Design a protein around this ligand. Structure first.
Ligand SMILES: [Mg+2]
Lengths: 222, 151, 111
């Protein structure tokens, strides 16, 4: 890869396959987001097949591929990880044995942190107890951005919260899939639900006019 | 009273039953250990048997004054240790704490911040043919101690 | 909270403790709950059908935040039925019509 001044880029490695990449890209480059200028640089040690190559050709101007292994420092230097803004890892949810997957992911994290101790990492984990091990890596600063997503914990938590009030699982899960408004004119239940689903969640610093006011007051007037 | 060996080469003592040296997390807290040696193993039932006698023996040699010895504390699976306990019973000043070396509580219970050395070994390294997963335990355990925080 | 984050690293479990006045101050967190418009302070608005009015009133009165409607599936059909399945509507616009057979998610206060 050749770094381009004034433009960030990220590095994605892990379980690269057709459906996973399609889902990730479709969600990432959605129009509802603000203007984006980040290049995506994959990294895998298996030559892609024709379907995957066709997908990359379709997203020609903003996706690049490089064959290699994430455990090799030469490869890590090849994809220019020092100036990379963040590094992602994708996990195989439908694996036969969960523990092997967690072991592989932990090894990848250790290797990346060895090569560089200040990068920011986002990952996936299949069991709760395995997540505890990541707290022992010397340079795993979770006070800054360094996030592990435990699928089991989140899933069971969603269900448990649904126990108190029903429908909470759906209502939450629709807040993270960026969707555009869809209009249907015939009158059924689907119309209002489709109007609702179009929402997402965003964060932003407040204006200076609200510094001295009370929280309920500023929750109003907005 | 028999103190040295038959051949006058090592320190010797009467055999002792295993339960007289097993400690608990609370129990080891009251005892104060300084300048000792802590040994971590990853064995279990049905694994290759490394001969721990060759390790402890050089420490408990002669030409060491009785007050000059180094206390030894094992940390690991009690099931594994019982298999070879008979060989090490004669050696003096040996103590065993059941636990896991990854459990950060145990490494605090024994005063690891006041130690002379900390050996880490493996047992089933030959059994596994998966190169990536080989030596995962030893690597991970070593890094754990690196990130420790002390007052 | 970070305190739970740090402690869980050491022992990977929990330990019973003793209540202290500063500790009991941690029992102040909003929780999730459901309301029914059939009866209560808001039963008047059940037929009125102004989502915004309830929103402003609820927040000022009880510091309740209401951000969803869990509506009966066939409440929009003139013909009657007996199906009791419902769906979710997230963040409705200000000028939305309501019916007495409606449930709304809310965030309770503590005590
Ligand atoms: Mg390009």
């Amino acid at each position: 890869y050749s770094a381009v001044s004034g433009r960030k880029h990220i590095v994605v490695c892990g379980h690269i396959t057709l459906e996973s990449v399609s889902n990730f890209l479709k969600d990432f480059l959605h129009k509802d987001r603000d203007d984006v200028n980040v290049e995506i640089v994959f990294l895998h040690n298996i030559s892609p097949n024709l379907e995957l190559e066709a997908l990359f050709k379709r997203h020609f101007t903003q996706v690049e591929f490089y064959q290699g292994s994430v455990l090799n420092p030469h490869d890590l230097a090849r994809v220019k990880i020092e100036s990379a803004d963040a590094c992602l890892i994708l996990a195989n949810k439908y694996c036969a044995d969960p523990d092997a997957e967690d072991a592989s992911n932990i090894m990848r994290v250790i290797s990346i942190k060895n090569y560089h101790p200040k990068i920011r990492i986002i990952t996936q984990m299949l069991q709760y107890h395995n997540k505890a091990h990541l707290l022992n890596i010397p340079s795993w600063n979770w006070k800054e951005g360094d996030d592990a997503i435990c699928l089991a914990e989140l899933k069971l938590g969603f269900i448990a919260q649904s126990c108190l009030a029903q429908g909470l699982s759906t209502m939450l899960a629709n807040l993270f899939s960026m969707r555009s408004f869809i209009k249907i004119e015939e009158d059924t239940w689907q119309k209002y639900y489709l109007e609702g689903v179009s929402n997402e969640m965003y964060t932003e610093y407040l204006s200076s006019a609200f510094v001295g006011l009370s929280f309920p007051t500023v929750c109003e007037l907005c | 009273v028999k103190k040295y060996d038959s051949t006058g080469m090592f320190h010797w003592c009467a055999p002792k039953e295993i339960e007289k040296v097993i400690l608990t997390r609370s129990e080891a807290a009251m005892t104060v250990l300084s300048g000792h040696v802590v040994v971590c193993i990853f064995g279990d039932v049905s694994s290759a048997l490394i001969g721990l006698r060759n390790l402890v023996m050089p420490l408990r040699a002669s030409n060491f004054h009785y007050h000059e010895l180094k206390h030894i504390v094992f940390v690991g699976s009690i099931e594994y240790l019982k298999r070879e306990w008979e060989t090490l019973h004669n050696f003096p000043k040996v103590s065993i704490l059941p636990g896991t070396p990854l459990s950060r509580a145990d490494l605090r219970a024994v005063n690891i911040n006041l130690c002379d050395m900390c050996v880490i070994l493996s047992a089933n390294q030959n059994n596994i043919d998966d190169t990536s997963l080989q030596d995962k335990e030893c690597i991970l355990a070593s890094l754990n101690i690196k990130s420790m925080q002390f007052d | 909270t970070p305190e739970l984050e740090a402690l869980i690293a050491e022992e990977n479990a929990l330990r019973g403790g003793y209540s202290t006045p500063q500790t009991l101050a941690n029992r102040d967190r909003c929780r999730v709950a459901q309301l029914a418009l059939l009866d209560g302070p808001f039963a008047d608005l059940g037929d009125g059908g102004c989502y915004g009015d309830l929103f402003c009133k609820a927040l000022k009165t009880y510091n309740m935040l209401c951000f969803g409607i869990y509506r009966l599936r066939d409440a929009h059909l003139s013909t009657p039925s007996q199906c009791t399945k419902r769906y979710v509507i997230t963040n409705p616009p200000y000028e939305f019509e309501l019916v007495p057979t409606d449930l709304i998610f809310c965030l309770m206060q503590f005590d």
